[PDB]
Design an enzyme around this catalytic site. Structure first.
Site, PDB file in Angstrom:
ATOM      1  N   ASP A 199     -52.731  59.486 168.533  1.00  0.00           N
ATOM      2  CA  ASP A 199     -53.921  60.156 169.042  1.00  0.00           C
ATOM      3  C   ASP A 199     -55.012  59.093 169.059  1.00  0.00           C
ATOM      4  O   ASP A 199     -55.448  58.627 167.999  1.00  0.00           O
ATOM      5  CB  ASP A 199     -54.269  61.332 168.128  1.00  0.00           C
ATOM      6  CG  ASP A 199     -55.565  62.020 168.504  1.00  0.00           C
ATOM      7  OD1 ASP A 199     -56.427  61.382 169.152  1.00  0.00           O
ATOM      8  OD2 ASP A 199     -55.733  63.184 168.084  1.00  0.00           O
TER       9      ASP A 199
ATOM     10  N   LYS B 160     -65.419  60.395 174.018  1.00  0.00           N
ATOM     11  CA  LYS B 160     -66.315  59.665 173.111  1.00  0.00           C
ATOM     12  C   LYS B 160     -66.631  58.286 173.626  1.00  0.00           C
ATOM     13  O   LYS B 160     -67.801  57.926 173.712  1.00  0.00           O
ATOM     14  CB  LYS B 160     -65.701  59.709 171.716  1.00  0.00           C
ATOM     15  CG  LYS B 160     -65.684  61.151 171.178  1.00  0.00           C
ATOM     16  CD  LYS B 160     -64.264  61.611 170.786  1.00  0.00           C
ATOM     17  CE  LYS B 160     -64.328  63.063 170.253  1.00  0.00           C
ATOM     18  NZ  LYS B 160     -63.137  63.300 169.418  1.00  0.00           N
TER      19      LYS B 160
ATOM     20  N   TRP C  32     -57.512  65.785 162.061  1.00  0.00           N
ATOM     21  CA  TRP C  32     -58.360  66.483 163.018  1.00  0.00           C
ATOM     22  C   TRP C  32     -58.091  67.981 162.940  1.00  0.00           C
ATOM     23  O   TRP C  32     -56.939  68.418 162.949  1.00  0.00           O
ATOM     24  CB  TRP C  32     -58.063  65.959 164.423  1.00  0.00           C
ATOM     25  CG  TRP C  32     -58.903  66.562 165.499  1.00  0.00           C
ATOM     26  CD1 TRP C  32     -60.260  66.655 165.519  1.00  0.00           C
ATOM     27  CD2 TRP C  32     -58.439  67.121 166.733  1.00  0.00           C
ATOM     28  NE1 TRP C  32     -60.675  67.258 166.689  1.00  0.00           N
ATOM     29  CE2 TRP C  32     -59.575  67.552 167.448  1.00  0.00           C
ATOM     30  CE3 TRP C  32     -57.175  67.301 167.298  1.00  0.00           C
ATOM     31  CZ2 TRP C  32     -59.484  68.154 168.704  1.00  0.00           C
ATOM     32  CZ3 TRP C  32     -57.087  67.902 168.548  1.00  0.00           C
ATOM     33  CH2 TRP C  32     -58.237  68.320 169.235  1.00  0.00           C
TER      34      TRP C  32
END
Lengths: 414, 397
Positions: B208, B244, B126
């Site tokens: 994560d 999300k 990321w």
């Protein structure tokens, strides 16, 4: 065969936070006469939180608008909010707005605005990555201010004289001396109106003397504006000092909170206003702010900023909001007047002018720690060891008991 | 000369037929954002509840949100939960959870104020990860091998070798499922090999979890790796985002889950987390956390929400199956098993940086120089155009 120790085995338990225990002791206290003067937010005459009528109205409008989506805001935040927030602080007619030399960064309350501003200064102000520029805060100041600037990397946090214990008001001469002795380019964090925790503000003429030293010694004003509107219900009049520094040609930061004047504490709505000398630097400053925000919270939440932007951009909602703010300011003014009148009717030793000369919901009463302990333990009146009270803890029903108890503490303790 | 110089005078400017495959959020078949039905329902309930006030939440956040969020990651009958050795810190999205966790480790992990502990991130990872850990003070950010450009999948042997050569106590940031940006995840057997090295070398897992639910359409399956590490006795952090899987991007809803060996360590860790939060955002916003807590606490709403998540995942699966089949129907050179072997919103297409320029310049299809595309940018209407344009890109440049 023994289990290894936790990787957290040496993490110390942090020191207890005083005010949280104070609220805890208050809530369990059985005495029906108990009073919480340690509350940190607005309360009605019935001891209740108050959701502003204009906020409920805008929340209903938002809920009824199905076209609003949840896609990320820009890193710097909602454009209409940032513009409206900076205009509230600076005034529609600000020369800095006319000259396009203002930036605004939406932030997680006033705390977030202070934090991003401090991070920026510790990277780009007074040199590159200069952690040694002195940062000056008032004696005393907002309880979390030192921690914000220390965490941003500043290694030299200093105090300037401010609260005068004997005079129960501003130590102007000490403040001016500390300004005169501050190294060139030092940062001064200035609480804008309704000083938290003391309630003591410089008058406009005193602000002019403060500004004169800062201009001459190239001291950077970092205003902290969390109570605009609480002095009078007049949002314009309550921002006089920030606007005076702008018209005197200062570059400055102003960390704004909407937690108190919108009652939006838990939606974390703030704005960092930047005033620069030339328009071209705003783009550069904001590009660095974007990088700081990106690695802290990425981009800011929408709900509270939407409420504020809708209110500040519509004349009808704006007028309703200013009335709601005036309701809060007037209740506080009433409690101050009523408390002072009762303390004087009881012929309480000492002067009590400060009770009405101070501004906003917080007041340094001048009570000493032993007197505070008496009020808590004997009278069930809860307040901080510094003697700070929140005027919103006073009510029509409790005023006689509070004033009588303070009179007892002053005459019987110390 | 004329005026006093600006204190900002030396501040640098920071570094910078059509289809958009560069989006980073869910989109419908008509290229629109999608507020989840369960979210609209809960928002109306919140708006109708006049008893809710706006007073500050606790520093660590709304209690029912923190509990529900950690339960989503760990499982409702997690032994760590029953043993009371889990903490949760509400945060400003996944980003805020990563930042608070990084700040804590840089102060209290592997010594006091040890900024030298290596922090390992995948190659690639990321794009904001390096900046978060650097800002927290870590001086030694390293990469582990992950994406294999030749095989278009996981370089397991390189990853394992980089784990074996990592100094003891190094921190590994592990994307828990639906890897951003490659869409390539370890299988459970591969996760077990990764965990074995990390256990032996005392390597700290910082998971994560930003796409729980997008990898498989199933929230339980997508949390397996986190739960496996818990079952193997690891202490760990897990940065959770609800941006999300709830579509709550702009309400900034996250949670940092902490798993320790015993309950007392959780108390001490949380007390330091409180100090970190207090000077960053003070306390977190209520609206998004209230929505998530209301949804996860109600079995009916939870069920409805899992349906909404599976709708998104199934549309992505449809776009993956379609693109691969249309490419293989066009006799496109190279293998295209990775389009359907990959997982989540994104695909590392395996398309070289110079085939990207063709898609953007000649056929107006927009993607990143890495070749990443968001599958949520494909639709029933653009699939044949994209598959043909990729066919041309591979056969021509």
């Amino acid at each position: 065969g023994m289990a290894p120790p936790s990787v957290f085995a040496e993490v110390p338990q942090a020191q207890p936070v005083l005010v949280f225990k104070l609220i805890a002791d208050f809530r369990e206290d059985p005495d029906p006469r108990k009073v919480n003067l340690g509350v940190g937010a607005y309360r009605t005459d019935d001891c209740q939180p108050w959701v502003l009528p204009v906020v409920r109205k805008v929340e209903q409008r938002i809920a009824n608008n199905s076209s609003l989506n949840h896609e990320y805001l820009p890193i710097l935040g909602l454009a209409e909010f940032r513009t409206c927030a900076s205009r509230l602080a600076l005034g529609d007619d600000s020369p800095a707005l006319q000259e396009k030399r203002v930036g605004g960064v939406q932030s997680l309350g006033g705390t977030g605005a202070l934090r991003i501003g401090a991070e920026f200064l510790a990277r780009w102000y007074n040199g590159t990555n200069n952690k040694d520029t002195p940062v000056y805060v008032s004696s005393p100041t907002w309880e979390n201010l030192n921690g914000v600037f220390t965490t941003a990397g500043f290694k030299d946090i200093r105090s300037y004289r401010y609260w005068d214990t004997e005079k129960r008001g501003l130590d102007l001469q000490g403040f001016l001396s500390d300004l005169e002795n501050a190294p060139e380019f030092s940062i001064f964090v200035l609480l804008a109106c309704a000083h938290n925790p003391t309630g003591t503000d410089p008058t406009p003429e005193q602000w002019k003397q403060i500004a004169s030293v800062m201009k001459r010694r190239f001291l950077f004003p970092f205003f902290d504006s969390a109570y605009q509107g609480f002095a009078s219900g007049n949002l314009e009049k309550d921002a006089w000092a920030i606007r005076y520094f702008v018209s005197e040609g200062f570059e400055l930061f102003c960390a704004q909170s909407f937690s108190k004047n919108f009652g939006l504490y838990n939606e974390r709505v703030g704005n960092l206003t930047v005033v620069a000398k030339e328009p071209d630097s705003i783009l550069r400053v904001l590009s660095q702010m974007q990088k700081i925000v990106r690695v802290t919270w990425s981009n800011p939440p929408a709900q509270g900023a939407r409420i504020v932007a809708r209110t500040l951009s519509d004349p009808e909602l704006f007028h309703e909001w200013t009335g709601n703010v005036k309701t809060m300011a007037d209740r506080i003014l009433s409690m101050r007047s009523e408390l002072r009148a009762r303390l004087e009717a009881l012929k309480t030793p000492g002067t009590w002018n400060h009770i009405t000369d101070q501004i906003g919901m917080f007041s340094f009463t001048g009570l000493n720690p032993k007197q505070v302990e008496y009020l808590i333990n004997q009278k069930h009146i809860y307040l901080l060891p510094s003697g700070r009270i929140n005027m919103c803890g006073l009510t029509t029903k409790n005023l006689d008991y509070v004033a009588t108890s303070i009179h007892e503490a002053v005459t019987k303790i110390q």
